[PDB]
Nucleic acid binder design. Structure first.
Lengths: 193, 99, 203, 207, 148
RNA sequence: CGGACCAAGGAGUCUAACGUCUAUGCGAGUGUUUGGGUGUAAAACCCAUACGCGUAAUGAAAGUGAACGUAGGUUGGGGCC
RNA sequence: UCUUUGUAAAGUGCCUUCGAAGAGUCGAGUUGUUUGGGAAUGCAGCUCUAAGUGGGUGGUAAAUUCCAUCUAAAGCUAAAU
RNA sequence: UUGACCUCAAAUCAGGUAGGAGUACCCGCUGAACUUAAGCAUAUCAAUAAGCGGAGGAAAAGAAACCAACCGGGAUUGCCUUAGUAACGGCGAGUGAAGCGGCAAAAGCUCAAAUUUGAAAUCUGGUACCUUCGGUGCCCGAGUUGUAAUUUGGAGAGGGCA
């Protein structure tokens, strides 16, 4: 049971796992079926690009906030700043999100210029009259790739002031750690004259 | 409050320019409206008074507000609701003794 | 608008006016059958906000369920097994007495769909629930497409599966970190987390 | 089947009955009564270690390993010794690798496709197929693998214009895109030196 | 494969490599980590010391995003600038035209100071940094500013 | 103790996680095959982002975080001059 | 084609009045079960039983003080599975 | 006396509907034990097997009383990862998620709480006709203890102004 110099292997197989083994032999079969589902979807809704337009949003948490990604939908403020009704934006292929709020200007600016580029690049077919001969671009995501925002010039100058930015890290940690006790000390020194 | 541009501290995080956007209508679900204050005032007039709230009113006027807050915490959930109910009992005692 | 007044009035359950109405109506429902038919709800405010519209094709029953725990049906109180399962009393039914109420009513009216249910009265022995039902083959429900979702054949006996609000509560179906075991059903999560998903090219 | 050898309610008789301790079928009066079951040694019992679907069937290879072996297989086609040692008829081929014009790729008919291959010297290697059409030795002939034959030339093109259709019905030849270069075609049976006719455009795009 | 196993070499030999006396059983020492304090105590004292006991305090709801701090040493700092611009930036060490290194862009939270950057002025954007890393960057003439 | 005799069947297999060793590819990187495109179609080919493990440890944790030197000295050390 | 189909619907900008939003329900105690959830994750029984700038959550109980994030106790809904 | 209303009946009334089968998958309830812990009682097996109730081509869930602490994301589901990790556990045996990230698929909404009050505008049923998965006309009923339109929190309603 415990023999030799071996690592302790926590293998979780003491249940009836053999009744619940799912083996994906249909990995190739589902990929063909997903492409067939995409092909018959594009045949159904030709010539729209088979997916809605998604915004450039910033990923949460400190691990992933360095990178932007695709959102669920644009905000009400973003669609209104682009100059179209949110119900109208749903019909012309723009995903709109009602719970995401706008609190960052460059994410707001990137999303509204995405909306300006989308409205300039698509056309809306008329309800009555002959629809124009327009080809279908199959991927709206490949039409509008998401670029990372501009951070800085590749080269710049050195600002050597000697402010000891490690001590800036050490002091900011210390004044964060000791804020409440210093405020409590400043409270009791005030009400004791 | 603006950030600090550094990874640790009180206001750790990147400097950004916000918008202070249009506030949602929700965040105001518990906001008291004029008709709803009217309905609750009329219901308080016609329901009479609860048996524990009768006990709470005589505990205010006889045995102390600290003792009544102890009893109202034993009745309701916690002290966040006991303090609200004792303040409500204080208001309707003062309403009963005024004018 | 009288239902705004009715809701805040009915919240005062320890009020003298509604305790007397509780005392009279707990006797009346005791003297009637266990499952009987209510021609109109005694809480029309609660009926309107749960989905009952007062048009024909909407049915209200009233039902009493015996309160308390669920005694384990083992002979002579003996549960033959390990001592952790030896308890017979103090065993609690996982579905609510609302869910039991809808189950017995839905068995009685197998031709009707259980829309919702709500507490009306209680005593020591019984809890009383007015259960809203609809006729899915009545033409006022098959027309008027606000309510024709319940004559769809997936919604039949929804109270026996936990689709109603009592069942959605009792299955723990809520969004949150408090409901990680039961998000889309506790058995769906248990299958998902205990399957050994093996691929063609092993990872 | 996971219930095979277990659609049975055999229970062991224990000892004291002068028979072995194996589970035996209860009941009576059927011939199956008293017969051993539930074991690998028993008739009608399950096999030892019943074959499961979750056995590793497909084997992961590193992508750099696959490209290494493909480039080695492509390089082995240019070796005149490995193509001849693999079992191809290149004794009258004037130059290895055999590169032909791009107009082979635009051939629409099989009748001119075989005349093209006979003109460029693959006539003996095409005759090496369809004279070797043998019935398969073993039980696999009634498992939809009835006929074995040798693999003739490979034809590598760049852009399709009908040569894959024109060489579909010719036995033994296979048509491969210069994007793909399937190692199952370039090194059949893990043996280097498939006889490959390249086209001019496929040779240019091989750069 | 099966034909290169020792089971095929054990065909004919009675115990199949398991011994006449020992008589290979189902689970003779227990199952799993059985008896790690009683009859496999010597194994759990020699080969895995530290197995039994509560060391440390419990951290409820751990997310590794909070503990995201991959470390980049100073000798690996110059890997960040690509090779098309690396030789142009190592040569002609200019204070006016200094290469900025978005260390967070690749995904290193903290720059450490394992040592010997070349004497060039280099701009380093950091979430965290060590004292010796800054002193060697200050010795090379570069500067460290903080980002988040 | 088992074995009347004969024929057939009949017992260290597969998986998950690994340990040592070996082979191979790439190598401070590596791993395409979750997925997408393509295809002669469960094959083959191609591909992005992450992520895994590694490149940093240590402490219970807050945290901190690896050149005095020709990356040190001594002894032995194959090979080379 | 329209005497069916404009004593029609829908959206957009100001400014003002506002803004109704689910109760034996949340929540608390206790009990039993369950959970990775640990001064108690969820559910259920019993007892108590809310509020309206309120309530829930923010993975250590409690008090005080903010901040952040949603809007429960009513309901439908395709695809990926 | 005669007309109601309310409640409760009855009818081989008129028209309908439910049962049962199958049950691989799904939604719940109930619910073990062998096993392992080298014993065994918590634990494990397992919130499983059996039992019971209920559906469909999927079901369930589903547009936050969410996650988070970020420069914030944004219904649900599924996969790769998180991760055999945080945590639980005679802290023993063992058990063990979730947020993020990538991808597949992406679709959003509806009532109750407001008096149309210058007109219950709503609907079932019957009858007659026709252009019949229904429509129109008339009548009896339902409904004012509230059926329609308008609103669902992202908003929205009222009152002018163009």
């Amino acid at each position: 049971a415990i023999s030799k110099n071996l690592p302790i292997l926590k293998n979780h197989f003491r249940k009836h796992w053999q009744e619940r083994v799912k083996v994906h032999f249909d990995q190739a079969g589902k990929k063909v079926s997903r492409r067939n589902a995409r092909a018959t979807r594009a045949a159904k809704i030709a010539p729209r690009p088979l997916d809605l337009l998604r915004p450039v949003v910033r990923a949460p948490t400190v691990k992933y906030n360095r990178k932007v990604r695709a959102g669920r939908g644009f905000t009400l403020a973003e669609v209104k700043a682009a100059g179209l009704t949110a119900a109208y934006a749903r019909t012309i292929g723009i995903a709109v999100d009602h719970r995401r709020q706008n609190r960052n200007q460059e994410i707001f600016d990137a999303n509204v210029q995405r909306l300006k580029e989308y409205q300039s690049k698509i056309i809306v077919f008329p309800r009555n009259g002959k629809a124009p001969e327009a080809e279908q671009v199959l991927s709206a995501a490949a039409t509008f790739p998401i670029a990372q925002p501009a951070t800085d010039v590749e080269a710049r100058a050195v600002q050597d002031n000697g402010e000891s930015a490690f001590r800036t890290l050490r002091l900011a940690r210390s004044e964060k750690k000791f804020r409440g006790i210093r405020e409590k000390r400043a409270r009791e020194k005030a009400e004791a004259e | 409050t603006v950030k600090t541009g550094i990874a640790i501290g009180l206001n750790k995080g990147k400097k950004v320019t916000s918008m202070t956007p249009a506030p949602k209508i929700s965040y105001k679900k518990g906001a008291a409206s004029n008709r709803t204050k009217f309905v609750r005032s009329l219901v308080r007039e016609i329901a009479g008074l609860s048996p524990y709230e009768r006990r709470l009113i005589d505990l205010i006027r006889n045995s102390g507000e600290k003792r009544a807050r102890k009893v109202a915490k034993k009745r309701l959930g916690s002290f966040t609701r006991a303090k609200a109910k004792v303040e409500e009992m204080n208001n309707i005692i003062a309403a009963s003794r005024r004018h | 608008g009288a239902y705004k007044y009715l809701e805040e009035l009915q919240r005062k359950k320890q009020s003298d006016v509604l305790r007397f109405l509780q005392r009279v109506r707990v006797w009346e429902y005791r003297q009637k059958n266990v499952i009987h038919r209510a021609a109109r709800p005694t809480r029309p405010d609660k009926a309107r906000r749960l989905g009952y519209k007062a048009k024909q094709g909407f049915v209200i029953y009233r039902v009493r369920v015996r309160r308390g725990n669920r005694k384990r049906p083992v002979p002579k109180g003996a549960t033959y097994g390990k001592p952790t399962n030896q308890g017979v009393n103090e065993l609690k039914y996982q579905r609510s007495l609302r869910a039991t109420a809808e189950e017995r009513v839905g068995r009685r009216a197998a031709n009707l769909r259980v829309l919702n249910s709500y507490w009306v009265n209680q005593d020591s022995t019984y809890k009383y629930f007015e259960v809203i039902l609809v006729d899915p083959q009545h033409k006022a429900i098959r027309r008027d497409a606000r309510y024709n979702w319940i004559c769809d054949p997936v919604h039949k006996h929804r109270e026996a599966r936990g689709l109603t609000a009592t069942g959605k509560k009792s299955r723990g179906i809520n969004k949150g970190h408090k409901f990680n075991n039961t998000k889309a059903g506790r058995r769906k999560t248990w299958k998902r987390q205990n399957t050994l998903s093996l691929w063609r090219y092993r990872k | 089947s996971e219930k095979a050898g277990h659609q049975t309610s055999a229970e062991s008789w224990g000892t004291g009955r002068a028979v072995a301790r194996i589970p035996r079928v209860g009941g009576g009066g059927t011939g199956r009564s008293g017969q051993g079951a539930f074991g690998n040694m028993c008739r009608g019992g399950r096999m030892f270690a019943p074959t499961k679907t979750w056995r590793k069937w497909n084997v992961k290879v590193n992508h750099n390993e696959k490209r290494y072996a493909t480039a080695s297989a492509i390089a082995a086609t240019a070796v005149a010794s490995l193509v001849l040692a693999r079992g191809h008829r290149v004794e009258k081929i004037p130059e290895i690798p055999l590169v032909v014009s791009t107009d082979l790729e635009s051939i629409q008919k099989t009748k001119e496709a075989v005349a093209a291959l006979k003109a460029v010297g693959a006539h003996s290697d095409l005759l090496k197929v369809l004279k070797s059409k043998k019935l398969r030795a073993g039980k696999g002939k009634y498992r939809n693998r009835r006929w074995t034959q040798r693999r003739g030339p490979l034809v590598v093109y760049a852009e399709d214009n009908g040569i894959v259709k024109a060489l579909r019905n010719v036995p033994g030849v296979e048509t491969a895109n210069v994007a793909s270069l399937n190692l199952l075609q370039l090194a059949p049976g893990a043996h280097l030196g498939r006889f490959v006719i390249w086209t001019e455009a496929a040779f240019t795009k091989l750069d | 494969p099966s034909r290169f196993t020792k089971t095929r070499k054990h065909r004919g030999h009675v115990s199949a490599g398991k011994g006449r006396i020992g008589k290979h059983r189902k689970h003779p020492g227990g199952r799993g980590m059985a008896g790690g304090q009683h009859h496999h105590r010597i194994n759990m004292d020699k080969y895995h010391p530290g197995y039994f006991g509560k060391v440390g305090m419990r951290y409820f709801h751990k997310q590794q995003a909070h503990f995201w701090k991959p470390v980049l040493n100073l000798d690996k700092l110059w890997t960040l600038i690509p090779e098309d611009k690396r030789d142009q930036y190592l040569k002609s060490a200019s204070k006016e035209t200094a290469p900025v290194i978005d260390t967070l862009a690749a995904g290193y939270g903290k720059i450490l100071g394992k040592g010997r950057i070349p004497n060039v002025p280099v701009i380093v954007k950091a979430r965290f940094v060590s004292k010796l890393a800054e002193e060697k960057i200050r010795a090379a003439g570069g500067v460290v500013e903080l980002i988040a």
